[PDB]
Amino acid sequence: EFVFKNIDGYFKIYSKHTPINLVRDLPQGFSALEPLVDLPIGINITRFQTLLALHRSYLTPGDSSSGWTAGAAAYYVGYLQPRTFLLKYNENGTITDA
Amino acid sequence: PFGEVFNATRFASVYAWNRKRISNCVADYSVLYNSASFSTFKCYGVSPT
Amino acid sequence: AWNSNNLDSKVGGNYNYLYRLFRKSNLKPFERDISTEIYQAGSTPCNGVEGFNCYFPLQSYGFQPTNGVGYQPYRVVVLSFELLHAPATVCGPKKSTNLVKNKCVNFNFNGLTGTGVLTESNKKFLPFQQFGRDIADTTDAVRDPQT
Amino acid sequence: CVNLTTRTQLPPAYTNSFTRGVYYPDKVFRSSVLHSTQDLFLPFFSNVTWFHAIHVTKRFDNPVLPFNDGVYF
Amino acid sequence: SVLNDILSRLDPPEAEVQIDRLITGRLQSLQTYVTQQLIRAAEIRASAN
Ligand SMILES: *[C@@H]1O[C@H](CO)[C@@H](O[C@@H]2O[C@H](CO)[C@@H](O)[C@H](O)[C@H]2NC(C)=O)[C@H](O)[C@H]1NC(C)=O
Ligand SMILES: *[C@@H]1O[C@H](CO)[C@@H](O)[C@H](O)[C@H]1NC(C)=O
Ligand SMILES: *[C@@H]1O[C@H](CO)[C@@H](O)[C@H](O)[C@H]1NC(C)=O
Ligand SMILES: *[C@@H]1O[C@H](CO)[C@@H](O)[C@H](O)[C@H]1NC(C)=O
């Protein structure tokens, strides 16, 4: 999971690796993203795109227009709007629930 | 490098002003305050000294 | 601000410095309009015709050696900074000192100043975090950057 | 630029993502305190547009997507 | 909000004004507490009687 955000001349990102097992939909539960990087940038960006890995093999035709067997992949995009969250903080400090 | 920004061959005009982001370094403001070769050094929310 | 009359005086003259005359709406704070177009007012749209009541975006200057001091060019630099958001590396000139523990003493950490005892803290901090706070939103813990 | 052929056009699949991607709003650490911060968040039970990059026939799609403040991927 | 921070970054005359503002704001806060406390104290006093 990642949350890309642009605020006050800073580009920011947040991440978590979850070892969820066998759920097609996003897992029921609570996990909290931890900021990974902060970059100070002025770029204004209207839209974004994703990068795929083409799984090129011997069985494929052998060209850049038709030669590919990419297979399975899945990704979900959700927008972010200003909202107020009451965030519970645990003794350690992990946000256990919100 | 506050000095390099202060002395430059070309300064961008008001329509497309030049902006530089300075960070990850140590700047001494005494020379700027100390030098006093500048006509106006107005300061808001920060004491120059 | 500070004058550079000598640099702005040329025999040929200088006119690469321009300021906008007209714009439909007010420019936003800390933003620059990079768009190149001629301001248009109401009817009789110019579409680049730039005759009467339609004006080109650019406007030059008049800096000349002969020209008076009062309207002579000034070189202006604006310094803007925001503080107490993240660990700050824009720190000034000062040196530093060895940490002191279990004794009431004044302390400053990366431009943060607090009047209390400093002791080794049991609380475990995750990599991103740089400050700790209590219920009353007062400083409770800090990390010496060097240490 | 190089292209790709035989793509399948279908309406976007939808799912409901609930209480996901809550991100530590800032740098402070607090213990056993409930805090309210007015920081952009994915709305709970917000609608989520699923996407597919799987051939399973002749299916491959990775087109441009609109971006607002909430670019949660 | 922090009192020390205000004093550290402001010259005395300006610092004077901001200090006063804080005190007025802080004086009012204290007044409310003491005034509130008295009413509660009186209420508790009645119960004790
Ligand atoms: C930019 O201009 C400033 C101001 O003239 C220069 O600062 C002076 O540099 C000389 C030579 O190093 C010193 O002897 C002076 O004490 C400095 N102050 C002044 C007011 O002259 C600076 O060297 C120039 N160049 C930069 C920063 O690149
Ligand atoms: C950002 O880019 C969009 C492109 O549609 C443009 O309309 C808008 O004016 C730009 N805003 C800024 C602040 O650059
Ligand atoms: C939280 O702290 C307790 C201390 O008993 C520890 O057992 C537990 O592993 C910690 N969990 C996390 C997520 O830090
Ligand atoms: C999500 O989109 C689907 C489209 O089928 C719609 O039925 C549903 O009402 C939407 N829910 C929300 C919360 O937008």
C82, C124, C128 member nearest A34 (Cβ)? C128
Q: Give the H or E element holding residue E18.
A: helix E12-48
Q: Measure the CA–CA gap between C94 and B26, rounded to whole angstroms.
A: 10
Q: Measure the CA–CA gap between A50 and A53, rounded to whole angstroms.
A: 10
Query: Which residue type occupies D46?
Result: S
> DSSP per residue over chain A, as a string?
-BEEEEETTEEEEEE------S-SSPPSS--EEEEEEEEE-----SEE---------SSS-SSTTT-------EEEEB--B---EEEE--SS------
Q: Given in angstroms, what resolution was this structure solved at?
A: 4.3
Q: A40 touching B, CB under 8 A? A: yes
Q: Which residue has the tokens 């799609």?
A: D61
CB D26 within 8 A of CB A35: no
The count of other CB atoms within 10 Å of the CB of residue C57 is: 16
- C-beta of A44 in contact with ligand 2 (< 6 A): yes
> How close C133 comes to chain A (CA, Å)?
11
Beta-ladder partners of A77: D49
Of E14, C16, C60, C73, the C-alpha closest to B39 is: C73
**Experimental method reported for this structure:** cryo-EM
> How close D24 comes to chain C (CA, Å)?
10
B17, B19, B37 member nearest C2 (Cβ)? B37
Which residue lies with its CA nearest to atom 10 of ligand 3?
A92
Q: C69 touching B, CB under 8 A? A: no
Q: Alpha-carbon torsion E38, E40, E44, E46, what sign?
A: positive
- Smallest-distance ligand from the CA of B2: 1
Q: Measure the CA–CA gap between C47 and D55, rounded to whole angstroms.
A: 49
A89 Cβ contact list (under 8 Å, min separation 6)? A95, A96, D30, D31, D32, D33, D34, D35
Query: Which residue type occupies D43?
Result: P
Inter-chain touch A78–D48, beta carbons under 8 Å: yes
Structure tokens at C142: 């800090």
Query: Which residue type occupies B16?
Result: A
Q: Could you give the 3-state DSSP secondary structure of residue E45? A: helix
Q: Measure the CA–CA gap between D18 and A18, rounded to whole angstroms.
A: 16
- C-beta of A66 in contact with ligand 2 (< 6 A): no
CB A13 within 8 A of CB A37: yes
The count of other CB atoms within 10 Å of the CB of residue B10 is: 8
Beta-ladder partners of E22: none
CB E5 within 8 A of CB E18: no
CB A60 within 8 A of CB D52: no
Which residue lies with its CA nearest to atom 9 of ligand 4?
D47
